[PDB]
C-alpha cells in the first residue's frame, strides 16, 4: 500500500506561567513513533515505537536540536500573531502545525503537505505544487509575503521530496514486522430489545489496523441512515482500532438488516445478519 509520515506540533501560550507548552508527535500511517514535550524532564525527542529505538545517538541528538529550534520559532510566532490580531498579553493562544509526505507502494513521493493554524482555524497552507501558499486572512497575508520573500516554499519542497520520503522508506523497512500489517476487523453483532416493538442491532469491528474502516447498515440491500448510530473510530490502546454501528429496528424484522464491513485487511467485504 501507500504510506504517510506526519508531524503534529501544538504550541500553547500561558502568559505569566513561563514559555509556551510545545508538544510534537510523529506518525507513520496510524502509528506514533516519536514525541517531544517542552514540560517533560528529558528535554529530548523520545521513542514511542519499538522500531525507532535502534536509531543511534546522532539521530536523537539531531531530532532533539531541530524540534527544540521549532518550539522557539513557535514561541516567537505566538507573539507576532498576537500583534497581528491586536490581542491582549493576558490570553492563551494556540499555533498548530501539520506536515508530512505520502509515498506509493514503490516508496516514491506522491504528495507533501504543510498546514498551520491559529486558535483552531486555518492560518496558512503550502499548496499542492509545494511552490506557493494560501493565506486564510489578512494577518496570514503578512506571513505569506514574508515567506515568499524568504523562499520558504523551496526549503519545505526540498524536505518533503528529500529527507521526508527517504526517512519514511527507512522507517517502513526498520518497522516492517509491524508497519506493513493489515489486521482485519474481528466482527460480531449484538441484539438488545428497547421495547416490546423495537430492538437495537449493534455491529462491532474490533482489533483492526489501519484505522480506516466503513460500517454500513442496509435494510433489504438499501443503505440506512435514519435510526442509526455510528461512533467515531477509537484506539484500543494496543495498536488497533474499534468501531460500531447500531440500528433500531421493528421487532421481528431483524433479518431484513445487514451490516457491511469494508477494510484494507479483508480479502472481500464482510456482511453480518442477526443470527437467532
Amino acid at each position: 500500500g501507500s504510506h504517510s509520515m506526519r508531524y503534529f506540533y501544538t504550541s500553547v501560550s500561558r502568559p505569566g506561567r513561563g514559555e509556551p507548552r510545545f508538544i510534537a508527535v510523529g506518525y507513520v500511517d496510524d502509528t506514533q513513533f516519536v514525541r517531544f514535550d517542552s514540560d517533560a524532564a528529558s528535554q529530548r525527542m523520545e521513542p514511542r515505537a519499538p522500531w525507532i529505538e535502534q536509531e543511534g545517538p546522532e539521530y536523537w541528538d539531531q531530532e532533539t536540536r531541530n524540534v527544540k529550534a521549532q518550539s522557539q520559532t513557535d514561541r516567537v510566532d505566538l507573539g507576532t500573531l498576537r500583534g497581528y490580531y491586536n490581542q491582549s498579553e493576558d490570553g492563551s493562544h494556540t499555533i498548530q502545525i501539520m506536515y508530512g509526505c505520502d509515498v506509493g507502494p514503490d516508496g516514491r513521493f506522491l504528495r507533501g503537505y504543510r498546514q498551520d493554524a491559529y486558535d483552531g482555524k486555518d492560518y496558512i497552507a503550502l499548496n499542492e505544487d509545494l511552490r506557493s501558499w494560501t493565506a486564510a486572512d489578512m494577518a496570514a497575508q503578512i506571513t505569506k509575503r514574508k515567506w515568499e520573500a524568504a523562499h520558504a516554499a523551496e526549503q519545505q519542497r526540498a524536505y518533503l521530496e528529500g529527507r521526508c520520503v527517504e526517512w519514511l522508506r527507512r522507517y517502513l523497512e526498520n518497522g516492517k514486522e509491524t508497519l506493513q500489517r493489515t489486521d482485519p476487523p474481528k466482527t460480531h453483532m449484538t441484539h438488545h430489545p428497547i421495547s416490546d416493538h423495537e430492538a437495537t442491532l449493534r455491529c462491532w469491528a474490533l482489533g483492526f489496523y489501519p484505522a480506516e474502516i466503513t460500517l454500513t447498515w442496509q435494510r433489504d440491500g438499501e443503505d440506512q441512515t435514519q435510526d442509526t448510530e455510528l461512533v467515531e473510530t477509537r484506539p484500543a490502546g494496543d495498536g488497533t482500532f474499534q468501531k460500531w454501528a447500531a440500528v433500531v429496528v421493528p421487532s421481528g424484522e431483524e433479518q431484513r438488516y445487514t451490516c457491511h464491513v469494508q477494510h484494507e485487511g479483508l480479502p472481500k467485504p464482510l456482511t453480518l445478519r442477526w443470527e437467532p
Binding site: 508531524y7 539531531q62 531541530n66 507576532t80 506536515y99 498551520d116 526549503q155 524536505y159 529527507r163
Partner: peptide
C-alpha cells in the same frame, strides 16, 4: 525525521 524555519 523532522524538517531542518522562517518566522511568521
Amino acid at each position: 525525521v523532522v524538517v531542518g524555519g522562517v518566522g511568521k
